[PDB]
Amino acid sequence: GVVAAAEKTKQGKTKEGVLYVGSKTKEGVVHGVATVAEKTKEQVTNVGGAVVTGVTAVAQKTVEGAGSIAAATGFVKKDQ
Amino acid sequence: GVVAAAEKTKQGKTKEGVLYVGSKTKEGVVHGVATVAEKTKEQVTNVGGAVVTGVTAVAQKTVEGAGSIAAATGFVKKDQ
Amino acid sequence: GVVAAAEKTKQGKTKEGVLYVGSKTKEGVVHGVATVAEKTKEQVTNVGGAVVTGVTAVAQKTVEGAGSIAAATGFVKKDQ
């Protein structure tokens, strides 16, 4: 029973402000989430929330609510 | 019973402010989350929250709420 | 029963301020979370919260709420 529950059981003014980023570069190479392999059997990539990538990559108020992820890999049975 | 529960059972003004980043570089290479391997059997990458990458990578108010992640890998049975 | 529970059971004004970062470099190479291996059997990377990477990488008010992560790897049975 490999489960994963999450409850934001909320019952009951926002004036946050700003966010500012600046960038000035010459050369840039970025790899966010890379899976490189050779001679494997299984490969999984469960993205529940977000994935944000780049020389300028911001993530504001990204995952509100309830993030739930089950993940099961393998579980072989060759007995007897 | 490999579970993982999380409850933000909230019942009941925000004036945070700012955030500022600045950057000026010449060469830049970034790898956020890399999985490199050779001759394996299983490879998993469960992203529950976020993944933010880059020469300028910010993450503001990212994972509110309830973050829940189950993760099971393996569990072989070849007995008798 | 490999579980991991977390409850932010909150029942019931914010004027934090600012945050400031500055950067001026010539060469930069960063690796956030790298898993390099050879001749293994299993590889897992459960990200519950966030992962922020870069020559300028900030993380403000990242994981509120309840962070929950189960993680089970292995558990082989070849007896008798």
Short mmCIF file of C-alpha atoms in Angstrom, two decimals:
data_model
loop_
_atom_site.label_atom_id
_atom_site.label_comp_id
_atom_site.label_asym_id
_atom_site.label_seq_id
_atom_site.Cartn_x
_atom_site.Cartn_y
_atom_site.Cartn_z
CA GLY A 1 0.00 0.00 0.00
CA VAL A 2 2.54 2.56 -1.15
CA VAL A 3 0.48 5.75 -0.88
CA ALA A 4 1.18 9.40 -0.19
CA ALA A 5 -1.65 11.66 0.94
CA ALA A 6 -1.64 15.40 1.57
CA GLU A 7 -4.52 17.59 2.72
CA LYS A 8 -4.46 21.36 2.88
CA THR A 9 -7.85 21.44 4.60
CA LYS A 10 -8.04 25.20 5.01
CA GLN A 11 -11.22 26.66 6.50
CA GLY A 12 -10.96 30.46 6.57
CA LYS A 13 -5.31 40.79 2.47
CA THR A 14 -2.06 40.07 0.60
CA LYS A 15 0.33 42.93 -0.24
CA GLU A 16 3.55 40.97 -0.77
CA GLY A 17 5.52 43.38 -2.93
CA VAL A 18 7.91 42.72 -5.81
CA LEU A 19 10.65 40.43 -7.08
CA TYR A 20 13.44 41.53 -9.38
CA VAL A 21 16.21 39.67 -11.22
CA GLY A 22 18.82 40.96 -13.64
CA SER A 23 21.36 39.21 -15.79
CA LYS A 24 24.06 40.08 -18.31
CA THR A 25 26.43 37.29 -19.31
CA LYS A 26 28.32 36.21 -22.43
CA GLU A 27 28.12 32.40 -22.65
CA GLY A 28 25.71 30.16 -20.80
CA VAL A 29 24.68 26.50 -20.98
CA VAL A 30 22.28 25.00 -18.44
CA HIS A 31 20.80 21.52 -17.97
CA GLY A 32 17.88 21.41 -15.56
CA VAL A 33 17.21 17.75 -14.79
CA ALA A 34 19.17 15.32 -16.95
CA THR A 35 19.10 11.52 -16.72
CA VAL A 36 21.93 9.98 -18.74
CA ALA A 37 22.57 6.26 -18.49
CA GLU A 38 23.66 3.19 -20.42
CA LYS A 39 22.50 -0.44 -20.15
CA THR A 40 19.73 -0.02 -17.61
CA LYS A 41 16.32 -1.63 -17.19
CA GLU A 42 13.91 1.15 -16.14
CA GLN A 43 13.91 4.94 -16.14
CA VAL A 44 11.22 7.13 -14.59
CA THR A 45 10.86 10.85 -14.01
CA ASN A 46 7.69 11.85 -12.16
CA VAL A 47 7.34 15.62 -12.07
CA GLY A 48 4.67 16.52 -9.55
CA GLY A 49 5.40 20.19 -9.06
CA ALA A 50 7.12 22.31 -11.67
CA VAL A 51 10.49 22.39 -13.39
CA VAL A 52 11.79 25.80 -14.44
CA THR A 53 15.07 26.15 -16.32
CA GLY A 54 17.12 28.79 -18.09
CA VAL A 55 19.90 31.28 -17.60
CA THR A 56 17.15 33.36 -16.00
CA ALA A 57 14.72 30.94 -14.35
CA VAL A 58 12.40 32.11 -11.56
CA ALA A 59 9.60 30.31 -9.76
CA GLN A 60 7.16 32.41 -7.74
CA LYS A 61 4.25 30.95 -5.77
CA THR A 62 4.85 27.66 -7.48
CA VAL A 63 3.14 24.75 -5.72
CA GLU A 64 0.25 25.79 -3.53
CA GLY A 65 -2.37 23.26 -2.61
CA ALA A 66 -1.54 19.65 -1.90
CA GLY A 67 1.32 17.95 -3.69
CA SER A 68 0.83 14.20 -3.87
CA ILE A 69 3.14 11.71 -5.59
CA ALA A 70 3.21 7.98 -5.38
CA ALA A 71 6.10 6.25 -7.10
CA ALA A 72 6.86 2.54 -7.26
CA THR A 73 9.56 0.97 -9.44
CA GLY A 74 10.74 -2.63 -9.49
CA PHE A 75 9.01 -5.19 -7.27
CA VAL A 76 9.98 -8.33 -9.14
CA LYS A 77 8.88 -11.83 -8.13
CA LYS A 78 10.60 -14.94 -9.50
CA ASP A 79 10.51 -17.14 -6.39
CA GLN A 80 10.22 -20.94 -6.54
CA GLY B 1 2.70 0.20 4.01
CA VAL B 2 5.27 2.73 2.85
CA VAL B 3 3.24 5.94 3.10
CA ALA B 4 3.97 9.59 3.77
CA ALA B 5 1.15 11.88 4.88
CA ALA B 6 1.20 15.62 5.48
CA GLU B 7 -1.67 17.84 6.61
CA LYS B 8 -1.58 21.62 6.76
CA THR B 9 -4.97 21.73 8.47
CA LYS B 10 -5.12 25.50 8.86
CA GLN B 11 -8.30 27.00 10.33
CA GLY B 12 -8.00 30.79 10.38
CA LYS B 13 -2.26 41.05 6.23
CA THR B 14 0.99 40.28 4.37
CA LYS B 15 3.41 43.12 3.51
CA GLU B 16 6.61 41.13 3.01
CA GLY B 17 8.60 43.51 0.83
CA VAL B 18 11.00 42.81 -2.04
CA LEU B 19 13.72 40.49 -3.29
CA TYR B 20 16.52 41.55 -5.60
CA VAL B 21 19.27 39.66 -7.42
CA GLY B 22 21.90 40.91 -9.84
CA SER B 23 24.43 39.12 -11.98
CA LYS B 24 27.14 39.96 -14.50
CA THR B 25 29.49 37.14 -15.48
CA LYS B 26 31.37 36.02 -18.58
CA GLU B 27 31.14 32.21 -18.78
CA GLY B 28 28.71 30.00 -16.92
CA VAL B 29 27.65 26.36 -17.08
CA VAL B 30 25.22 24.89 -14.55
CA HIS B 31 23.72 21.43 -14.05
CA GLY B 32 20.79 21.36 -11.65
CA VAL B 33 20.09 17.71 -10.85
CA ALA B 34 22.04 15.25 -12.99
CA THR B 35 21.93 11.45 -12.74
CA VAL B 36 24.75 9.88 -14.75
CA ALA B 37 25.35 6.15 -14.47
CA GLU B 38 26.42 3.05 -16.39
CA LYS B 39 25.23 -0.56 -16.10
CA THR B 40 22.46 -0.11 -13.56
CA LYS B 41 19.03 -1.67 -13.14
CA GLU B 42 16.65 1.13 -12.11
CA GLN B 43 16.68 4.92 -12.13
CA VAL B 44 14.01 7.14 -10.60
CA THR B 45 13.68 10.87 -10.04
CA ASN B 46 10.51 11.91 -8.21
CA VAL B 47 10.20 15.68 -8.14
CA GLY B 48 7.53 16.62 -5.63
CA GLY B 49 8.30 20.28 -5.16
CA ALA B 50 10.04 22.38 -7.78
CA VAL B 51 13.41 22.41 -9.49
CA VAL B 52 14.74 25.81 -10.57
CA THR B 53 18.03 26.11 -12.44
CA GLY B 54 20.10 28.72 -14.22
CA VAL B 55 22.91 31.20 -13.75
CA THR B 56 20.17 33.31 -12.16
CA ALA B 57 17.71 30.92 -10.50
CA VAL B 58 15.40 32.13 -7.72
CA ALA B 59 12.58 30.36 -5.91
CA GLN B 60 10.16 32.50 -3.91
CA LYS B 61 7.23 31.08 -1.93
CA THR B 62 7.81 27.77 -3.62
CA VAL B 63 6.06 24.88 -1.85
CA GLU B 64 3.19 25.97 0.33
CA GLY B 65 0.54 23.47 1.25
CA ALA B 66 1.34 19.85 1.99
CA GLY B 67 4.19 18.12 0.22
CA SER B 68 3.66 14.37 0.06
CA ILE B 69 5.96 11.85 -1.64
CA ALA B 70 5.99 8.12 -1.41
CA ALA B 71 8.87 6.35 -3.12
CA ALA B 72 9.60 2.64 -3.25
CA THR B 73 12.29 1.03 -5.41
CA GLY B 74 13.43 -2.58 -5.44
CA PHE B 75 11.68 -5.12 -3.21
CA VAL B 76 12.62 -8.27 -5.06
CA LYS B 77 11.49 -11.76 -4.03
CA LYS B 78 13.19 -14.89 -5.38
CA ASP B 79 13.07 -17.07 -2.26
CA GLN B 80 12.75 -20.86 -2.38
CA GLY C 1 5.46 0.39 8.04
CA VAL C 2 8.04 2.90 6.87
CA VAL C 3 6.03 6.12 7.10
CA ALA C 4 6.78 9.77 7.75
CA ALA C 5 3.97 12.08 8.85
CA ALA C 6 4.05 15.82 9.44
CA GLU C 7 1.19 18.07 10.56
CA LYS C 8 1.31 21.84 10.69
CA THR C 9 -2.08 21.98 12.40
CA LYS C 10 -2.22 25.75 12.77
CA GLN C 11 -5.39 27.28 14.24
CA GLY C 12 -5.07 31.07 14.27
CA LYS C 13 0.74 41.28 10.07
CA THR C 14 3.98 40.48 8.22
CA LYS C 15 6.42 43.30 7.35
CA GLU C 16 9.61 41.29 6.85
CA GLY C 17 11.62 43.65 4.67
CA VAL C 18 14.01 42.92 1.80
CA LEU C 19 16.71 40.58 0.56
CA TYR C 20 19.52 41.61 -1.75
CA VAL C 21 22.27 39.69 -3.56
CA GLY C 22 24.90 40.92 -5.99
CA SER C 23 27.42 39.11 -8.12
CA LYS C 24 30.13 39.92 -10.64
CA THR C 25 32.47 37.08 -11.61
CA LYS C 26 34.34 35.94 -14.71
CA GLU C 27 34.10 32.13 -14.89
CA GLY C 28 31.65 29.94 -13.02
CA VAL C 29 30.57 26.30 -13.16
CA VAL C 30 28.13 24.86 -10.62
CA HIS C 31 26.60 21.41 -10.11
CA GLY C 32 23.68 21.37 -7.71
CA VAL C 33 22.96 17.73 -6.90
CA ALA C 34 24.89 15.24 -9.03
CA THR C 35 24.75 11.45 -8.76
CA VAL C 36 27.57 9.85 -10.76
CA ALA C 37 28.15 6.12 -10.46
CA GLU C 38 29.20 3.01 -12.36
CA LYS C 39 27.99 -0.59 -12.06
CA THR C 40 25.22 -0.11 -9.53
CA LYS C 41 21.78 -1.66 -9.10
CA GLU C 42 19.42 1.16 -8.09
CA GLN C 43 19.47 4.95 -8.12
CA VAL C 44 16.81 7.19 -6.60
CA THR C 45 16.50 10.93 -6.06
CA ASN C 46 13.34 12.00 -4.23
CA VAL C 47 13.05 15.77 -4.18
CA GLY C 48 10.39 16.73 -1.67
CA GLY C 49 11.17 20.39 -1.22
CA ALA C 50 12.93 22.47 -3.85
CA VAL C 51 16.31 22.47 -5.56
CA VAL C 52 17.65 25.86 -6.65
CA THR C 53 20.94 26.14 -8.53
CA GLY C 54 23.03 28.73 -10.31
CA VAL C 55 25.85 31.19 -9.85
CA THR C 56 23.12 33.32 -8.27
CA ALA C 57 20.65 30.95 -6.60
CA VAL C 58 18.35 32.19 -3.83
CA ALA C 59 15.52 30.45 -2.01
CA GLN C 60 13.11 32.61 -0.02
CA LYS C 61 10.17 31.21 1.96
CA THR C 62 10.73 27.89 0.28
CA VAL C 63 8.97 25.02 2.07
CA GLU C 64 6.10 26.14 4.24
CA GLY C 65 3.43 23.65 5.18
CA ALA C 66 4.21 20.03 5.93
CA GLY C 67 7.05 18.28 4.17
CA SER C 68 6.50 14.53 4.02
CA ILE C 69 8.78 11.99 2.33
CA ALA C 70 8.79 8.26 2.58
CA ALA C 71 11.66 6.47 0.89
CA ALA C 72 12.37 2.75 0.77
CA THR C 73 15.05 1.12 -1.39
CA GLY C 74 16.18 -2.50 -1.40
CA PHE C 75 14.41 -5.02 0.84
CA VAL C 76 15.33 -8.18 -0.99
CA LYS C 77 14.18 -11.66 0.05
CA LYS C 78 15.86 -14.81 -1.28
CA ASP C 79 15.73 -16.97 1.85
CA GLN C 80 15.38 -20.76 1.74
#
